[PDB]
Design a protein around this ligand. Structure first.
Ligand SMILES: *[C@@H]1O[C@H](CO)[C@@H](O[C@@H]2O[C@H](CO)[C@@H](O[C@@H]3O[C@H](CO[C@H]4O[C@H](CO)[C@@H](O)[C@H](O)[C@@H]4O)[C@@H](O)[C@H](O[C@H]4O[C@H](CO)[C@@H](O)[C@H](O)[C@@H]4O[C@H]4O[C@H](CO)[C@@H](O)[C@H](O)[C@@H]4O)[C@@H]3O)[C@H](O)[C@H]2NC(C)=O)[C@H](O)[C@H]1NC(C)=O
Ligand SMILES: *[C@@H]1O[C@H](CO)[C@@H](O[C@@H]2O[C@H](CO)[C@@H](O[C@@H]3O[C@H](CO[C@H]4O[C@H](CO)[C@@H](O)[C@H](O)[C@@H]4O)[C@@H](O)[C@H](O[C@H]4O[C@H](CO)[C@@H](O)[C@H](O)[C@@H]4O)[C@@H]3O)[C@H](O)[C@H]2NC(C)=O)[C@H](O)[C@H]1NC(C)=O
Ligand SMILES: *[C@@H]1O[C@H](CO)[C@@H](O[C@@H]2O[C@H](CO)[C@@H](O[C@@H]3O[C@H](CO[C@H]4O[C@H](CO)[C@@H](O)[C@H](O)[C@@H]4O)[C@@H](O)[C@H](O[C@H]4O[C@H](CO)[C@@H](O)[C@H](O)[C@@H]4O)[C@@H]3O)[C@H](O)[C@H]2NC(C)=O)[C@H](O)[C@H]1NC(C)=O
Ligand SMILES: *[C@@H]1O[C@H](CO)[C@@H](O[C@@H]2O[C@H](CO)[C@@H](O[C@@H]3O[C@H](CO)[C@@H](O)[C@H](O)[C@@H]3O)[C@H](O)[C@H]2NC(C)=O)[C@H](O)[C@H]1NC(C)=O
Ligand SMILES: [Cl-]
Ligand SMILES: [Cl-]
Ligand SMILES: [Cl-]
Ligand SMILES: [Cl-]
Ligand SMILES: [Cl-]
Ligand SMILES: [Cl-]
Ligand SMILES: [Cl-]
Ligand SMILES: [Cl-]
Ligand SMILES: [Cu+2]
Ligand SMILES: [Cu+2]
Ligand SMILES: [Cu+2]
Ligand SMILES: [Mg+2]
Ligand SMILES: [Mg+2]
Lengths: 678, 678, 50, 92, 50, 101
């Protein structure tokens, strides 16, 4: 495998943010430990929240925080999950305390207190989230999630090597290192890493472990959770886009499932399974993940989900689905004191908020002490942790479904959200399909689409795992050695989509590019009435057509919905000293890694469908001008594939184009050929 | 909890053994690592087995080793188990290379070669075993199994604290250590350790985790495997006791189950479950054990044992049981070219060897390349490792049943061997019950039995876990820090059994003392026809009766079937400097720890039965000067409870005595109150 | 109205109180005999208490 | 006649053990408010106006709220005298 | 003629310091300490068992 | 089967519909039953054989004596072997399993 080199897009950081950038980074370094000689220690040790009550812009947030704090927060050195309810109430109170701090000095002091006094996992989760959301930290860069929680992004066989080197303060016999996949250079140690194999995954799903365990794929889900946490009201999260929250929920989970389906098809694994909550569960999972104090829970094959100890959770899960089916019978109804009209496509907001059980679902009823989450209950049932783990607050065996860092590693995750999206797609049958008059752009004809050769490959990617290890006092006061994971990752060669358009008149238009499967697991072509849910939106942009022939060359590196790789901690520090930040990390971290556009190609040339549509440009409404670089026009997200295609010939429009394309793999077909001999 | 201090019974080490004792100990220190500056390194690096082919007394042993060695032994830093068949062939070939070395220098050199070049787990298993069986090393002391494999005797929450301290080279904030159960003194670190709770054990079985996870209980089983390894010929293992090998098998497993059954009753858990191979298995197990590179396999509740992937293993298991039931129908038969008469109590040798599938079972048929083990197959089925873990030689998820160090932690272990002993107790129905004439000792009457108060308690016990951590070159060259686990353990206050005997004549007699339950899980008294299997043999000794009244005061510290605690490595070194060894560790390691004689007492006062029998002394043919301290007379092991009692009034003999006794608990009833606040 | 007259609006409270007391006291006797917690069960599975 | 609806006094304690089965005694003192006239007739069955089971009629989410001077939690032990099992009623 | 459980009469003595003279309500509850797993039951789980 | 029979001190056992015969408490009995049937199928494979020290020729119609005594586990089945303290009956084990006590 080749090593990865890429020139990184950078832009100048506002000089007023340089100090804020530095302090945020210093508070994140080695967050698993507290060093008494560090600056934050002294500040955090004596900071008194109650005495500084006026330094928070919401008195009620301080009062609720102190009330929980007197009862006692969870101790340090315990596994933390947002899904453990007692721990969740505490961390939400801490996050709001961070958020309502009136200025950066108060926020810094509050975070310094939290690191000194409180659980490490709670500290870093709340702190990372607060940087994403505070107005005064907007524009700074955060390290990638895998460099903050490296223990959640590699298997225990790699981690145990890293811990042993730290234990030994190096290699006892350094020439033996390469034989066990360890390289040593300039106080940095490099650990070659394999994805999971057939021990972890059954039914040949280990074939795509390079994908579902990819650090960027998992980080994408983590960012999405951090951007749209379920417990916060939509007004705070997205302001004037509040009424599109449930639409964003559907769009992101659809894209995640469709992209996973592509990787299944590229590996001969067929469609995502559906399952009966009351039958044996036929997808086992044996993660080589740990929370360092405890192993992750393993799910044996044919695990019985509906024990007597699970039956209350099962009854809640089943009632929630039954309720949604009854709402589809009703069509127009009042739910949680909200008027809902399922004939109207705007009701996707309610539908998405319903399936997430988020704060907006309950905003019109009085504040409740009774709350249950469909997703949390389903994750707990599928996780296979011991039932006692749920009954006792202090003791948990963590599962992959307890962390947004790791959810995408469990195949049960895709089956769970496919079940959810099956229900939502039944609701989509209420929507009126787009008429030909809406879809047809008179005077605009796509004559041709030509695509450069589509080639994927594996390459080594280095990332920094130093935050996983516990450093000595000598190392914490000086600089630490570096522990670098070297891991093959999927990538694709840059390609251009060339669109040839004849236009009667000069016009400003919107262009979209979608990518979709051509054949199902049975080798049969998927018709458009069934395939519309499977298309993945790649690109979204405006363009000015002149009268006559137009040629648009759109580079894969320009695709709206994909980002450059995050940059490593050391590069972040280097760029800072020149006053720069990685552009994609700050503004466009919420998009899929560009390296993941294409599923790994096949020996046959994996068949895919490229869909191109051109339609007239209408500017987004003034209310949405606050966030324009994320919304190109006024259309529903995923348009024109946001609703069922019932008559495929409606999509035979001159301003639409379907092109068969094939994905080829260059170099080694598998990621594991990384031994010294290889 | 009090701290434990005990005087260790010591005896002189033969002066010719001092160098041998020193070199064996040095080769065991930090065996997970190879230090090039140590003496063994150059010897091991340069030693050529093939060049020294004549230095081994069996040419075939060297030849078989070289053939496997050329094919390639497993690499270092891989999980090793005697149940991984390719690994078993390697380590057994290695063990025979160790055993057939002509002298100690050749043995030491071969062991130095093994440590430098081969898998760490394979070296230490074979080396520890070879020391137990070689004639020229017998009489030296080995460290206790929990100090050789500390990672197999504590949960991952303790180990992770130990690794973190090694990573940090101390505590960053030393005074905070005690809040997290860590004490520091003189370059030694002390880690308070809890047994597992309800996360690991279901159905309230966590109540006795202090017992089934006890390091001495688990170490007793490890010693039993090492003294009587299944793959070895009986002539090598026990010489003139060869025809009692299957009898020892029944005796040891009966005692292990019977003792576990007492702890169950003392914790309100009732009888050991029986189970159907083809039904869902109702005893889950979530071990917090790891092999540092991989977690141990977890078995979810209601795990289905008989999948299509397991079907060959299930069919073999069921056939083996079906075969044995057919042999009980036949009564007298030829099996494996052995003539067997189940009417004869000597056929317990065949029966025990049958259920163990050991080397003696096949000794009369030509050597076979086809071999299956009932026990190994059963362990694989119950361990719930992924089925792929069995298909691929290179990759395994270890289970508690893969190691004799951890087998006793899994409640399935007792259910498996209860199934086996159920079959053997069915065979025992063939045997003729003892007559009144055999049982009655004319002229000898037990007038009274009085017992001191029976009191159990928990006490802290320190053991050395330094062999679990990876040391720096600095620490390996001078001296390591010490990592000490501090753990509550069951113990009993010393007690005496006083036996009042009237004797007509002067005679040398045999006295035995048994301990048994009185009530079953339903609270009903167990009659002797059902209880004979449940009695646990405590003592076995000869005594001289004078005419008239005799009084025997027998101390629990003198009990034949119980031993002192193993002594820690440091005490071993001190005793060596005065030429002493722990007497029980060298001569009587195959016996149960004395601290476990009594089940933990209960708030009701746990009811038990003491059984004493006096019978005439017939001298056993000595067979060796040693045998008298291991075989007191010529009777069946467990006599008079080696066969069914069909008519209890036969046991109403004057030379027998049944005494109800009660076990009282002093101090805290639970082991977990060890926090700093407590 | 016939049963408790003016306490009618506490009828469901008496129901909860009495069954809670019955279950709690039975639970105490279970604990005193080492029998643990009251089982929960799935209507659609085999019932494990004969 | 008057109190057939209450548990038999003999069943107050679960059956004990010789050294004593552990239990918790909880005592609370709070101000007396007379049950209002609407329910004066059944006063010997209703001592005050509080919910039945008060203060344990609803979830306790923060116990330090129950660290009140007018409340007290006491560990107690139940001892069993005589035969522990009820079945030894045989003639012998 | 049937064996039945019973308990010996016992008295509860309550020591109360009062700032003011007032008429009060006293309640006495009995509850478990340990669950079937031998672990102390916290009040957030135990309130239903009193 | 819900018999309205009693032994005056005790009711007869009732067998609910879909009663599961092969519980963990029954497994030893189930194994004996299944083995006993398996053995007889093996005897049909053998055709001519020695069982319980009796020579049996299943081609000969007189062997219905061995066959019937085999299925009844009666004393004549065991008459040519030394008196046994170990005894199990196919029929008694099956009746116990189907009886649902
Ligand atoms: C990610 O996952 C992949 C897939 O599992 C994994 O790849 C495998 O790595 C291992 C190393 O860890 C490779 O094993 C080595 O392979 C070489 C080459 O073998 C090939 O060619 C020879 C003929 O030349 C064939 O016989 C063989 O079958 C292969 O075709 C071997 O030469 C190595 O053998 C030595 O080491 C073994 C112990 O590991 C011994 O069993 C053997 O006797 C050899 O010993 C010799 O060298 C020793 C020093 O190493 C020395 O001590 C001895 O005295 C003696 O001189 C070795 O087996 C394996 O081939 C890879 N498999 C594949 C399919 O590629 C990655 O390692 C993994 N990466 C990470 C980071 O996890
Ligand atoms: C993997 O990830 C780790 C963890 O993030 C990276 O390590 C960090 O690297 C950064 C940048 O290289 C380090 O930041 C630097 O630390 C110095 C602290 O050194 C101490 O010790 C010296 C001597 O004992 C003292 O003189 C000093 O004052 C410190 O007490 C700082 O001095 C550096 O200053 C720089 O930044 C400031 C502010 O921007 C400038 O004003 C300075 O002029 C100078 O440019 C700097 O802050 C950080 O300490 C490292 N952390 C750890 C835990 O080691 C690895 O580099 C990374 N590895 C790879 C391969 O990617
Ligand atoms: C083996 O297993 C046992 C049981 O699982 C462990 O014992 C527990 O250990 C923890 C410490 O890790 C103990 O927790 C401490 O309890 C103190 C007392 O708590 C009671 O009283 C207070 C005040 O009235 C109540 O608030 C509380 O709800 C209890 O009823 C607390 O004072 C401690 O809190 C302090 O520290 C925490 C952080 O640790 C802070 O958040 C707080 O603000 C406060 O400053 C602390 O919670 C617990 O009591 C033990 N349980 C027992 C004994 O049953 C062993 O530690 C374990 N051993 C090993 C080696 O793992
Ligand atoms: C816990 O176990 C460790 C490791 O087994 C013990 O350390 C060992 O202690 C012995 C006795 O002091 C050391 O032997 C000594 O070696 C030095 C240097 O060669 C020499 O000067 C002495 O004469 C003696 O030979 C041994 O090296 C040492 N091993 C390590 C790895 O440190 C430790 O004592 C145990 N701790 C407790 C509390 O039991
Ligand atoms: Cl500051
Ligand atoms: Cl090394
Ligand atoms: Cl060699
Ligand atoms: Cl520390
Ligand atoms: Cl610590
Ligand atoms: Cl013995
Ligand atoms: Cl035969
Ligand atoms: Cl063998
Ligand atoms: Cu499966
Ligand atoms: Cu179970
Ligand atoms: Cu049952
Ligand atoms: Mg929990
Ligand atoms: Mg394997």
């Amino acid at each position: 495998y080749p090593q990865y080199h890429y020139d990184v897009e950078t832009r100048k950081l506002d000089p007023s943010l340089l100090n804020i950038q530095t302090k945020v980074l210093s508070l994140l370094e080695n967050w698993k430990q507290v060093n008494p000689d560090d600056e934050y220690y002294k500040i955090g040790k004596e900071y008194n929240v109650e005495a500084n009550m006026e330094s928070y812009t919401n008195r009620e947030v301080v009062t609720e925080f102190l009330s929980l704090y007197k009862a006692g927060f969870i101790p340090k050195n315990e596994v933390f999950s947002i899904f453990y309810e007692n721990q969740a109430l505490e961390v939400i109170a801490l996050y709001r305390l961070f958020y309502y701090a009136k200025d950066f000095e108060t926020f810094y002091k509050t975070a310094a207190f939290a690191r000194v006094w409180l659980n490490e996992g709670q500290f870093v989760y709340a702190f990372y989230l607060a940087v994403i959301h505070r107005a005064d930290t907007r524009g700074i860069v955060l390290p990638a999630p895998y460099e903050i929680w490296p223990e959640y992004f590699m298997n225990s066989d790699v981690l145990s090597k890293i811990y042993r080197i730290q234990m030994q303060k190096g290699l006892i016999i350094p020439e033996q290192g390469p034989y066990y996949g360890i390289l040593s250079k300039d106080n940095a140690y490099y650990f070659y890493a394999n994805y999971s194999g057939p021990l972890t995954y059954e039914d040949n799903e280990n074939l795509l472990s390079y994908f579902i365990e990819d650090i960027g794929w998992n980080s994408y889900y983590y960012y999405f959770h951090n951007r749209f946490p379920f417990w916060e009201n939509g007004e705070q999260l997205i302001g004037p886009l509040k009424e599109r929250r449930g639409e964003i929920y559907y769009y992101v989970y659809q894209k995640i499932l469709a992209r996973y389906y592509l990787e299944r098809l590229a590996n001969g694994l067929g469609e995502i399974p559906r399952f009966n909550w009351l039958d044996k569960y036929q997808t086992s999972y044996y993660p080589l993940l740990s929370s360092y104090q405890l192993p992750f829970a393993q799910r044996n094959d044919d695990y019985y989900l509906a024990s007597g100890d699970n039956i209350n959770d099962i009854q809640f899960i089943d009632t929630y689905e039954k309720t949604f089916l009854q709402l589809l019978q009703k069509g127009q109804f009042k739910a949680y004191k909200q008027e809902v009209d399922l004939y109207n496509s705007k009701s996707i907001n309610f539908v998405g908020n319903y399936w997430q059980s988020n704060a907006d679902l309950y905003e019109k009823v009085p504040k409740r002490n009774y709350w249950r989450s469909y997703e949390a209950t389903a994750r707990r049932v599928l996780g296979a942790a011991p039932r006692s783990s749920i009954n006792y607050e202090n003791m948990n065996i963590p599962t992959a479904l307890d962390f947004y860092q790791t959810s995408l590693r469990d195949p049960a995750f895709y089956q769970l959200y496919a079940k959810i999206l099956d229900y939502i797609n039944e609701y989509k049958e209420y929507l009126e399909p787009y008429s030909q008059d809406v879809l047809h752009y008179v005077g605009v004809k796509i004559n041709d689409v030509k695509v450069d050769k589509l080639v994927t490959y594996f390459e080594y990617f280095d990332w920094n795992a130093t935050n996983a290890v516990y450093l000595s006092e000598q190392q914490l006061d000086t600089v630490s050695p570096s522990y670098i994971v070297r891991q093959p990752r999927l990538n694709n060669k840059p390609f251009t989509v060339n669109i040839d358009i004849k236009s009667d008149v000069e016009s400003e238009v919107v262009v979209k590019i979608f990518l979709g499967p051509k054949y199902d697991g049975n080798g049969l072509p998927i018709s458009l009435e069934d395939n519309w849910i499977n298309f993945i939106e790649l690109d979204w942009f405006t363009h000015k057509l002149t009268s006559g022939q137009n040629k648009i060359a759109r580079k894969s590196e320009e695709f709206f919905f994909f980002k450059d790789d995050s940059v490593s901690l050391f590069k972040i520090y280097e760029l800072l000293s020149n006053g720069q930040v990685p552009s994609y990390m700050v503004d466009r971290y919420i998009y899929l890694p560009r390296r993941l556009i294409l599923p790994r190609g096949t020996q046959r040339g994996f068949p895919l469908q490229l869909f191109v549509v051109v339609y007239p440009y209408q500017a987004p409404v003034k209310e949405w001008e606050s966030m324009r670089q994320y919304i190109v026009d006024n259309k529903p997200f995923g348009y024109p594939f946001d609703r069922p295609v019932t008559l495929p010939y409606y999509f035979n429009q001159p301003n639409m184009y379907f092109k068969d394309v094939y994905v080829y793999q260059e170099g080694e077909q598998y990621p594991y050929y990384n031994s010294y001999w290889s």
